[PDB]
Amino acid sequence: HLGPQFCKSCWAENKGLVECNNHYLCLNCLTLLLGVSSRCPICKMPLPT
Amino acid sequence: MEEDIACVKDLVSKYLANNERLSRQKLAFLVQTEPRMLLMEGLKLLSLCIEVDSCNANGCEHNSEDKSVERILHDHGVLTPSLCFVVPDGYKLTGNVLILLECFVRSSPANFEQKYVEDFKKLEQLKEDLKSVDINLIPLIDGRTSFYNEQIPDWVNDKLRDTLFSLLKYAQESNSLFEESEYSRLCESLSMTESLNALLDNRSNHYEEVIASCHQGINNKLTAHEVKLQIEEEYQVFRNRLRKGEIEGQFLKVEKNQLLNEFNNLYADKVAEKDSVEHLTHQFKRASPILRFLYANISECQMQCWRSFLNKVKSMRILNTRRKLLLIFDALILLASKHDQVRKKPLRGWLGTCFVSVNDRLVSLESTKKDLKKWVERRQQVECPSKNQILNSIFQKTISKATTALRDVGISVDHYKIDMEVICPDGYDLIMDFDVSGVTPTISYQRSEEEAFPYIMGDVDLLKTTDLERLSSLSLALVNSMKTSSTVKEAYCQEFSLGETEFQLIYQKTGECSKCYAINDNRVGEVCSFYADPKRYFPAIFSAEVLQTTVSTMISWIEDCNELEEQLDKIRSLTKMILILILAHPSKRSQKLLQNLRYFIMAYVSDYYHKDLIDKVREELITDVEFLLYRLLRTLMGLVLSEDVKSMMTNRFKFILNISYMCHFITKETPDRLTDQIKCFEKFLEPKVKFGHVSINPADTATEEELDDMVYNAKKFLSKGGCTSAKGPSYKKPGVSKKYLSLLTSSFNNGSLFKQESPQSYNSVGPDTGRLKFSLSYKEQVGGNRELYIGDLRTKMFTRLIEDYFEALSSQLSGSCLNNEKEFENAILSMKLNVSMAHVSYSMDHSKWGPMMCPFLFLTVLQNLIFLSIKGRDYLSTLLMWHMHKMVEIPFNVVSAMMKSFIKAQLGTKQSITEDFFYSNFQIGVVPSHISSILDMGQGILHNTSDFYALITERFINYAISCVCGGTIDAYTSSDDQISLFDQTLTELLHRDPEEFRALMEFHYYMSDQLNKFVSPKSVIGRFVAEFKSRFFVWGDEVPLLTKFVAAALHNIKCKEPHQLAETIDTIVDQSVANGVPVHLCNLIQIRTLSLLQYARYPIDPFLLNCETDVRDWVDGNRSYRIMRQIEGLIPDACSKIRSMLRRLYNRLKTGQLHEEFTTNYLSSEHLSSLKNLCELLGVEPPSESDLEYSWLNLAAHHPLRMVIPTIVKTIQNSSIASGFVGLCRTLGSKCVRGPNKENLYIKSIQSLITGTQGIELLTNSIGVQYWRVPLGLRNKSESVVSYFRPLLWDYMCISLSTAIELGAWVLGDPKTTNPCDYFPLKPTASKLLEDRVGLNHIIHSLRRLYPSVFEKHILIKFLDLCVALDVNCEALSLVSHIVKWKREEHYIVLSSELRFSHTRT
C-alpha cells in the first residue's frame, strides 16, 4: 500500500494497474511511457517490466 | 489657595527665557488674580511660546494681531474678492510668493490627523482661491504631538501642568464656568490619553430595537441533540425536494468531453468553428497593425550627436525665444544632417520632408526653411552681413551659451563628439539648397484592410526571437513616447532602429494617455497605424529572451508526453502566439479570458463542477483580437487536452494553468479609470437595489424614517425562507435564515463546533461626529478590480478595535488561516496529505463576499454567542451598529459621468440599473452623494470579523455534514475562499454512491446559502487537484505557476533608487526560484532588469544583481551572498585571499580569542590601511597593491540619489509601472547624484570627471558589471571625483563577514564549481544568528551605544553588534533588510537537476 490506487499519469484508471517503485500506473500508460525512455517521468527511475 | 499660585509665579519668573513680547504677555499675566483667568493666560503663554518657536524655526513673520488673509493682501495693495476668511499663524512675503504657517497641538492621533487633514483642505482651498488672482502660495502646517518648547525647561513645564491640574481639583471653577462639555474637552486636552468607554452613552430605543431584531425567532440555546435532529430532518426534506425536482441541482459531474464541447461552443455566434493551427498562424501574423508590423519580412552620426547635445541644452532655457530657439535647433540639426550625408553616411534621422529635431518631434523641411528665411529676412531688414553672417553669428552665440551651460555642470561638451565643423560660413545657403524630396509621413486614423500594408505580412517563423525583439523595440518606443514634454509638422516622433532600418513611431497627442501611434519607415512611408495605450506595453520592453525561455519551459513540461510529439511544434507555436497576442494587445478582456481559462481547467480535472461555471467563464469579447485569443486558447486546449492523450495529466494541467496565468503579463492597471470606476460602483450598488435598501443622503442626524427603514431591512435580511417553504430556497439571495443562524449559534454555544474635534457622545448611528463616512475606490487586480472602503482615522480606529476583537476570537479557535501563517502552513500540509491520498478536496470560492455580507449579520451572530469567561461586548455591538449605519461617498467622477449621461438623455437606450437609479434620483432634484445601506460589508474594513464568521459557519456546516453523513471535513478559510478536505469515508462514498455524494454537496451549497456564504461557480469538487490562496496542489506536490512569477518580475519596476529596485527584483526572483522557476529564466529576468537600468545610462555596480546564479544562492543564500558570488566572479584572485582571511577571522571569533569587542572600532578607520592591518594581525598574506585598488563607482556616496549618514536608521522608519520606468529614466538622466558641497550634477558629469583622470580603467566582466581599479596614488588626494568611488575589496570583506554571521561558515570556503519536471522541496539550512524576532531587537541598543547622535536625530552580549557595525560604516548594502522590510523564504521547491550543476564550498 503506497498511496492511492490510481494511474498517476491518467487520474482515471483504477483497475488493472501495475506498480512502480513508489506509485501505480496503467497498462496503457506503461506501454506509452516506455516509448520515450526507460526512466520514470514521475519518480525518475527505471520502469519495471 | 494662593500658595501654589505664588510658587508657580516664582518658577515662571525664574525659569523663563528673556524675550520682549513674552515679557509683555507676562506682565499681562501676573496682574490677574482670578484662577480661571490664570489658567487662560497660562495656556495663552504656552500657545505663544509654541507659535514663536515655530515662527523662528520656519523663518516666517509671526502673526500676533490675528490678521486674516484679506488683511495681509490689503496691507500690500492686492485687491481680492470675497474669499475664505482664514487667520494663519505666520506669513512670509517674497514678491509673488507667500509662505503661510498654521500651528496646532493635539494629544490623540485621531484628532491630530483630523486637524491635519482639515488644515490641509483649507490650505488647498486658499491656494485655489489665490491662483484665481495669480498669487503663488506655499503651505506649511506645524502639528506638534507634545507640549515641549525651547524657552521653558521640561520639568518646570510639567510642574506647571500638574499645578494647573491641581487647581482643577476645586469646584468653584466648575460651577462658575467650564460647562461639562468644555470642562471634559479641557481635561482631555491636558490629559495624556483600547476601548475608551468613557463616552456619553445616549443610545436611544433604536439600539434595543435592533438588538431585539437579532434575538426574536432565534433560539441560540438548543441542545447538542436537538440541533442534530433539526439538521437531520432538514437534510431529509432537502434531499426529498431535490430528488423530486423542487430544488434545482447546482453541481454537475465533470465530463471532460462535455466540458471541452461547452468551452469550444463559447461565442458560437461570433466565432465560426474549430480552426487549425496553420490557419491560426496565417490569420495571426496579419491580424492587427501591431501584429502586422511584426512578421513583416523587412530586409560618427553627426546628426545624432548634435540632436542629443541640443536635447541636453533645451531644458536649461538658454534664451527666452522658445519658438526661435527651437528654430535655431532645427537649423543646427539640418546642418549636421547635411554634413553627415555629404561625407559618407546615409540619411539616419530622416523620414522624407520631415526630420527628428530636438524634443523628439518631427519638423517639416519646407516649414523649417520658410520660417528660417522669414527670420533671417526680418533680421536683415534692420541694419553688411550677406544673408549668411547673421545666421553664423547667432549660431555661434547659441553654441557658446550651450557650451557654457554644459561647462559649469561638468558635461564636457566634447563628450558628445560634436565635431563642431558643421557651422560653415555658407550655412544659410547650405540649408536653403537642402532638398530630400521624400515620402510624406502621416498617421491615417481609421485605416483599412490588411491589403494596404507596405511589407509582406507574415514571414517570421514562431521559433526565433525576432518577433519578440520587434515587440520589445516597439514597446520601448511607446514607453518613451510617454515622456514627451510637448512645448509649444506638429507630430512628435520616437525612433527604434530594429535591423538595417530605423522605424519611427509618430504621435501627435502627448502624455501617458491612450493615443494613436503610427509606425513609419523612410523607405516606404507609413507602415502601420494603431490606437494604443502606451502605459500598458511595459512587460516586453527588454524581455526578448525571458519570454522565449518561459515559452520553452512551458513546452518542455509536456514535451516528453509521447502523445503530443506529433503536435509539439503546433503547441509551441500556439503558446508563443498567445504570449505575443497578450503582450502586443494588452486588454482587460484578454486578462479576464485567461483567468476564466484558469477556472475552467481547475474544474476540468475534477469530479463535480458548478452548473454556472461556463456562464462565468464566458466574458464579453470585442475588437476581434480577443476573439483571436479565444480561438488560440480553444485550439491549444484541443491539442493539449485532446481525447486521446491520457498521459501525464499533471504536466498538461500545469501547462494549461500557466497558459491561464499568462494573464499577469497584461498589466493589472485600468485601461480607462472612469469606466472601471463606474463598474466598481455597479458591483457595489446592484446588490443593494436588488435587496431594497438604498437610502441616499443619510442625513447624519438620523431621521426616524431612515431608522425605521433600517430596522425593516434588518428584519427582512433574516427571513431567508429555507427548503421548508413552498417555492423553496432562492439561491444567491442575500440574507440568513433564522433557523440556520439559531442552529449555528446553538452549536457554537455548546461544545460541538470547536469543543473641537473629539467625539463626546455617541448613539446607535455614530459618535456625534460622523456615522462612519467611507469612500469607495477601486483596487487594481488582474481579472477584475476589487473594492476599497477607505475611512478617516476615527473610523480606522473603530474598525481596528472590531478587527482586533474578532482576530483574538479567531486565534482562540484553530480553523481559520488569514493572518495566521502557522495555520496557513498547517493547511498546506493537510492539503498535500489529502491530495496525495486522492481524497476529495472541495476548493470553494464565495461569490460576492463583500457586497452580500452584512455588519448586521455579524452583530446578530455576536449577540447570540455566550463566550463564557457586559462591557467590551457592548462596545463591540455598538461599533457593529455604527457599521450598519455607514455612509459611502459615491466617487465624484462616477456621479459626474452619470449626471452627464442624464443630461445627454434628457436633451438628445436600455439603461442599466445604476443608470436608472441615478436618473430617478436626478429627476426629483436630489443628487446621490452617499449611499447608506445595511447590505454592505466593507471590502477589507471588516476582514477579521468576516473571517471569524466564515470560520464558525464553515465549522458548523462541516459538523452538520458529518452528523448527517458520517464523515469529518477539515476546513481552512481565508475569509473569501476556502478549502474543505474530506476524509476516507466521503471519498469512498463518492466512489460507491455518486448520487448521495452529490446530494450531500447540494445540501452543503444550500446550507451555505442559508448563511451569507453563496458558493461561487468557480468552486471545484475534485479528489486530485486542490486550490487554496492561489496555491495549487496536484499529487502532494505544488504547481510552479511559473508564468505568474515571471510576469510579476517583468512588471514590478518602480521609480525608486536603483539599488532598492535591485533588492525588490532580487526578492521577486528569490520567490520565483523558490516556487517553480528554473535558474536560467531567473538569470534572464535579472539580465532584463539590468538592461532596463542600462537604458537609463546607469553605472551598473557589482552590488546590484547576480545574473550568473546556479540555484545554490537562492535556496541557501541571501542577497548579500549573491552579490558576494558576483564579486568573486569579478576578482577571482583577491577575493580568494579575502575569503581566507575572513575564514581565519571567523574561526578566531566564534570559538577563539575575543575579537568582536574591538572589531566594531576597527571597522571605522580607513579601509585601505585596515585591510593590510587585519591581514597582518591574522598573519595571512595581505592583498597586493594591484589587487587592492579595485573599486566601484558609488553615486550615493555623499548623499543618496534625489529620486524625485547611514541608511539602516532610515529603513526602520515604517502613477503606473510604465510611468515608473519613465521617471527612473528621467531621474537617472537629470541631476540625481549629489556632491560634497551640497550641489547636484548629472551622471554624465561623473563619467566625464572619471575620464578626466589617467588612473581609472573601467573594465567590465561580461554583462556590464562595471568595476574600476582606480590606483592608490590618487586615492582621496585633493578631493577629486574619486570620492564617489568605494573600495571593492573592503565592501566584499564586509559582505562576506556579514553573510558568514548570517548563514554558517561554509560561505568562506573556496568555491569549487561542480527532464524539467523533478523538484526537491528542501529547506534553507542555516544556523542563523539573526533570530526572526528581530523587529525592534537589540539592534537599536547597539545603535544607541555606538551612534548616540544618530539615535537622537532621525530615530524615535549577543553576536549582533557586528551585523549593525558592518552596514553603518561599510555602506555597500543594508545587510539587514529581509527581517524588518522584506521577509525570508523557506521550503524551496527547486529543480533537482539544477542542484547537481551547482557550485560547492567548504
Next chain:
RNA sequence: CUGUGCG
C-alpha cells in the same frame, strides 16, 4: 523651470 538612453 525634464529624459535623448535599444542597432
